[PDB]
Amino acid sequence: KEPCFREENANFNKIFLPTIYSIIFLTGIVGNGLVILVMGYQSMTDKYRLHLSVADLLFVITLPFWAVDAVANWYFGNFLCKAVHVIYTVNLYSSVWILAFISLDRYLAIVHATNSQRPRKLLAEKVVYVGVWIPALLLTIPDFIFANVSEADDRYICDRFYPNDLWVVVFQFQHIMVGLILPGIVILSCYCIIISKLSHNIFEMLRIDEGLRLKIYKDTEGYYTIGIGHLLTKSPSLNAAKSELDKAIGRNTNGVITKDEAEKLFNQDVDAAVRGILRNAKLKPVYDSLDAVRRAALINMVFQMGETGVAGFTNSLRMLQQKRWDEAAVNLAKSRWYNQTPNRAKRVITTFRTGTWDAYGHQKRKALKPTVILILAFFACWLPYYIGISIDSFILLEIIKQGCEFENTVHKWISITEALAFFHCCLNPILYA
């Protein structure tokens, strides 16, 4: 088995790569630079992005070398050859793992909001160095060792040359693992726990406003109801109300239910309510523009007065959508809703104005939307490469044998997709838009 031969491609090396490397460099060198002088001199989530943008900067200033390597030759000696591969290893590890810390930061700010102000500080001021940089720096060791200049085809090249396939497969596996899989699992874990907390927050909100009822209750209109405003039956029968509650919870209650059960039932009613909103020309656009906390505000209103009801606030709705909070609050402040149930209204309105739980600690808003976009964007960038190098390592192991046209096509995908990945530098600056 002689190795598969692939041709070098001129247009790729001579036109395509230098083009991309330049665009990225320009939009990168300025974008991160502005982030560093603005955000650097003159919010925890910004702190991490300061780091991130330093990690990307250090990379972009390496691209001119990458480019002249692509077209011509490696003119720059062996120290700079090592430095180029080193920086790269630091960036791609630090860059993703800083995101994980951002995700942990959110987990702490949201799941443990009551008092996690401390551990969030140490994560940002101290741990970040012990858990991101130093370990990034120690992982460059192999680059110092194996990154060397080689003479090949009347020019110089700057490659990592390891001893053998045994080495290569292991580090290529370490690369996948440390590069996506691990930090991915961290991120996804953080995400999962937050959405669980987000929906429990809603539950506590309607607990105050609509009230938690653990025993079957006859409301002012004679309807039988349990939990958080969940109507069981309109019928006169206590025995009918008793008969529904059992069918709803799935056991033989005697007209009482537990805290866990009230909530499971409440979550179902949130689900249905949210599906209604997504299927409503008026409410969908407004709900989509809003954040986690303000969604909760809208969901409250629906629960009280039904979605048609809420869709009637033409004016206030259009302000909410347009993010003009105070004007939304003053309109709603004078409505039939406000007179009939004024304390609930005022809290729900304060929520719409502030985007915090001050009506339920003061002025403490913590946003997710910008972070979620950063991370997803970041992985969208790298994902194709990593699918690429997976398949490449499946070939190395001989899990998939398919001749040279396949092997060579996979190599080609990796080159394209590696180059396109480098756009992850700019995501950070751009997203400040």
Partner: peptide, 16 residues
Amino acid sequence: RRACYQKXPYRRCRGX
């Protein structure tokens, strides 16, 4: 090129 190596008398890289 990041994944080069020695296979017997051959130099290879894994591409990328």
